[PDB]
Amino acid sequence: ELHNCVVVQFDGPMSFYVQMESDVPALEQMTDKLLDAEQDLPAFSDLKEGALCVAQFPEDEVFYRAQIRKVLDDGKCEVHFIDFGNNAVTQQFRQLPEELAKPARYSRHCELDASTISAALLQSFIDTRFSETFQVEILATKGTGTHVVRLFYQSKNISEKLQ
Amino acid sequence: RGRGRGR
């Protein structure tokens, strides 16, 4: 079975996040709810590795559910946007209502079986299609939540592109 | 990119 998705982040065949076409509705709501309340959210100042909050995405100037990854200098923190998959450095953090923290992350961490692969060529191939639909076959869900899959692009297991 | 970016 193949699931429609959008590869939003891609650091390699071992580490890349995607968004399932089915979590799109919920994510769309998360966005409305976080935009409808963005301005009234109190400042979140407990910056510690792992903490959940709502951080501002430099490109958008928009706040998204995020998880702090590292504490840098002068308020700056490397955050991870759980519903997307990309990272960023920002200084703008706000509290995350517990009702809007209950939902699961809407982007899924993935990887292809290293056992079947042996890279800058595929990287550009994926990024050149950031705005296009792919397909995943979830072969398993690793113990840490990371999916092990096979990536398709209009029916070509992109694995054909790996030597 | 992605979805539900909002802007």
Side-chain angles (χ1 to χ4, degrees), chain A residues 8 31 64 84 86 127 130, chain B residues 1-6:
Chain A
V8 335
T31 315
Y64 297 95
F84 289 84
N86 69 296
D127 296 326
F130 62 74
Chain B
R1 49 172 160 184
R3 261 300 206 166
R5 267 306 180 176

Side-chain angles (χ1 to χ4, degrees), chain A residues 1-117 119-120 122-155 157-160 162-163:
Chain A
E1 169 192 52
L2 280 44
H3 299 76
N4 295 338
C5 67
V6 168
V7 194
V8 335
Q9 178 63 201
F10 192 99
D11 314 299
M14 294 308 96
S15 184
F16 68 105
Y17 310 74
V18 309
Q19 286 173 170
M20 313 298 290
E21 197 177 65
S22 62
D23 294 304
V24 167
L27 170 61
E28 292 269 304
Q29 166 171 293
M30 175 68 69
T31 315
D32 308 318
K33 287 165 158 282
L34 267 186
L35 211 30
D36 197 307
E38 185 186 66
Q39 182 66 264
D40 323 301
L41 297 181
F44 172 80
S45 48
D46 173 77
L47 313 178
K48 64 177 188 187
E49 285 194 33
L52 240 75
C53 61
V54 181
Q56 186 187 54
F57 182 34
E59 276 217 308
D60 290 11
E61 304 270 289
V62 179
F63 286 85
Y64 297 95
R65 308 204 298 183
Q67 184 174 65
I68 295 167
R69 285 305 173 58
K70 304 175 200 179
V71 169
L72 303 166
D73 303 62
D74 306 304
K76 306 159 207 161
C77 275
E78 183 177 310
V79 309
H80 174 82
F81 290 112
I82 66 105
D83 299 316
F84 289 84
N86 69 296
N87 272 57
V89 179
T90 170
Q91 294 174 295
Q92 302 309 323
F93 320 94
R94 298 193 185 180
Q95 236 134 77
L96 175 50
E98 300 78 296
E99 144 219 53
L100 305 175
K102 294 198 173 299
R105 57 179 292 147
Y106 291 119
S107 71
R108 300 184 180 174
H109 192 321
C110 291
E111 62 184 52
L112 314 162
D113 184 1
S115 184
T116 71
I117 69 94
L122 215 195
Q123 174 73 190
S124 53
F125 179 89
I126 299 273
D127 296 326
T128 304
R129 315 209 159 56
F130 62 74
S131 58
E132 308 197 300
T133 285
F134 298 57
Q135 284 191 295
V136 283
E137 193 196 314
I138 294 73
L139 290 183
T141 298
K142 280 208 150 192
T144 44
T146 277
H147 287 320
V148 165
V149 303
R150 292 171 192 166
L151 195 36
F152 300 85
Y153 173 78
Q154 302 197 285
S155 300
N157 173 337
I158 68 162
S159 70
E160 34 94 309
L162 293 188
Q163 312 87 333

